[PDB]
């Protein structure tokens, strides 16, 4: 709601996302908790993640937007910078956070991450190994989770 600066800022992020969502992204606060959002990122076109519809949750603190939220993929993911539990290694969530970034820019940065993995953070050792040694097999694995992202188990 509107009780703290972080909550009003989150409402403004929500407004931006409603009326002007970047391509292939969506998100909204949970019904009972403005600090926890559900989001969906569509895989960027021209990439192995194309056609993928990936759910994520985002958890904000009352320090937002000064402190970045923690973002986790809910859908199964196969990507060098994404752990088995869904946690994400993203520069703007760790080292390059700016209070100018909102939910929209966070979702697009992850969308871009899917296209261009950061080789400094091999969170998924097999995904990193295949990405640097076997693009075909890498894309085979990504295709599998793309299809699985259409089903929300």
Curated annotation (Swiss-Prot):
<keyword id="KW-0808">Transferase</keyword>
<dbReference type="GO" id="GO:0004842">
    <property type="term" value="F:ubiquitin-protein transferase activity"/>
</dbReference>
<dbReference type="GO" id="GO:0031625">
    <property type="term" value="F:ubiquitin protein ligase binding"/>
</dbReference>
<keyword id="KW-0156">Chromatin regulator</keyword>
<keyword id="KW-0833">Ubl conjugation pathway</keyword>
<dbReference type="GO" id="GO:0005524">
    <property type="term" value="F:ATP binding"/>
</dbReference>
<dbReference type="GO" id="GO:0009411">
    <property type="term" value="P:response to UV"/>
</dbReference>
<dbReference type="InterPro" id="IPR050113">
    <property type="entry name" value="Ub_conjugating_enzyme"/>
</dbReference>
<keyword id="KW-0991">Intellectual disability</keyword>
<dbReference type="GO" id="GO:1901526">
    <property type="term" value="P:positive regulation of mitophagy"/>
</dbReference>
<dbReference type="InterPro" id="IPR000608">
    <property type="entry name" value="UBQ-conjugat_E2_core"/>
</dbReference>
<dbReference type="InterPro" id="IPR023313">
    <property type="entry name" value="UBQ-conjugating_AS"/>
</dbReference>
<dbReference type="InterPro" id="IPR016135">
    <property type="entry name" value="UBQ-conjugating_enzyme/RWD"/>
</dbReference>
<dbReference type="GO" id="GO:0005654">
    <property type="term" value="C:nucleoplasm"/>
</dbReference>
<dbReference type="GO" id="GO:0000785">
    <property type="term" value="C:chromatin"/>
</dbReference>
<comment type="pathway">
    <text>Protein modification; protein ubiquitination.</text>
</comment>
<keyword id="KW-0225">Disease variant</keyword>
<dbReference type="GO" id="GO:0000086">
    <property type="term" value="P:G2/M transition of mitotic cell cycle"/>
</dbReference>
<comment type="similarity">
    <text>Belongs to the ubiquitin-conjugating enzyme family.</text>
</comment>
<dbReference type="GO" id="GO:0006338">
    <property type="term" value="P:chromatin remodeling"/>
</dbReference>
<dbReference type="GO" id="GO:0006301">
    <property type="term" value="P:postreplication repair"/>
</dbReference>
<dbReference type="GO" id="GO:0005770">
    <property type="term" value="C:late endosome"/>
</dbReference>
<dbReference type="GO" id="GO:0006511">
    <property type="term" value="P:ubiquitin-dependent protein catabolic process"/>
</dbReference>
<dbReference type="GO" id="GO:0033503">
    <property type="term" value="C:HULC complex"/>
</dbReference>
<keyword id="KW-0067">ATP-binding</keyword>
<keyword id="KW-0967">Endosome</keyword>
<keyword id="KW-0458">Lysosome</keyword>
<comment type="subunit">
    <text>Interacts with RAD18 and WAC. Interacts with RFPL4A and CCNB1.</text>
</comment>
<comment type="function">
    <text>E2 ubiquitin-conjugating enzyme that accepts ubiquitin from the ubiquitin-activating enzyme E1 and transfers it to a E3 ubiquitin-protein ligase. In vitro catalyzes 'Lys-11', as well as 'Lys-48'-linked polyubiquitination. Together with the E3 enzyme BRE1 (RNF20 and/or RNF40), plays a role in transcription regulation by catalyzing the monoubiquitination of histone H2B at 'Lys-120' to form H2BK120ub1. H2BK120ub1 gives a specific tag for epigenetic transcriptional activation, elongation by RNA polymerase II, telomeric silencing, and is also a prerequisite for H3K4me and H3K79me formation.</text>
</comment>
<dbReference type="Pfam" id="PF00179">
    <property type="entry name" value="UQ_con"/>
</dbReference>
<dbReference type="GO" id="GO:0005829">
    <property type="term" value="C:cytosol"/>
</dbReference>
<dbReference type="GO" id="GO:0070936">
    <property type="term" value="P:protein K48-linked ubiquitination"/>
</dbReference>
<dbReference type="GO" id="GO:0070979">
    <property type="term" value="P:protein K11-linked ubiquitination"/>
</dbReference>
<dbReference type="GO" id="GO:0043161">
    <property type="term" value="P:proteasome-mediated ubiquitin-dependent protein catabolic process"/>
</dbReference>
<feature type="active site" description="Glycyl thioester intermediate">
    <location>
        <position position="89"/>
    </location>
</feature>
<keyword id="KW-0547">Nucleotide-binding</keyword>
<feature type="modified residue" description="Phosphoserine; by CDK9">
    <location>
        <position position="121"/>
    </location>
</feature>
<dbReference type="GO" id="GO:0006281">
    <property type="term" value="P:DNA repair"/>
</dbReference>
<feature type="domain" description="UBC core">
    <location>
        <begin position="5"/>
        <end position="151"/>
    </location>
</feature>
<dbReference type="GO" id="GO:0000209">
    <property type="term" value="P:protein polyubiquitination"/>
</dbReference>
<dbReference type="GO" id="GO:0043130">
    <property type="term" value="F:ubiquitin binding"/>
</dbReference>
<keyword id="KW-0234">DNA repair</keyword>
């Amino acid at each position: 709601h509107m009780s703290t600066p972080a909550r009003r800022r989150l409402m403004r992020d929500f407004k931006r996302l409603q009326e002007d969502p970047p391509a292939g992204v969506s998100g909204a606060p949970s019904e009972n908790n403005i600090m926890v959002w559900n989001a969906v990122i569509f895989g960027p076109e021209g990439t192995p993640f194309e056609d993928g519809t990936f759910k994520l949750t985002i958890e904000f603190t009352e320090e937002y937007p000064n402190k970045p939220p923690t973002v986790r993929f809910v859908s199964k993911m196969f990507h060098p910078n994404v752990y088995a539990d869904g946690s994400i290694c993203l520069d703007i969530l760790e080292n390059r956070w700016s209070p100018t970034y909102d939910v929209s820019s966070i979702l697009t940065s992850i969308q871009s991450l899917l296209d261009e993995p950061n080789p400094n953070s091999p969170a998924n050792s097999q995904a990193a190994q295949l990405y640097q040694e076997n693009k075909r097999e890498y894309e085979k694995r990504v295709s599998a989770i793309v299809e699985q992202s259409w089903r929300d188990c």
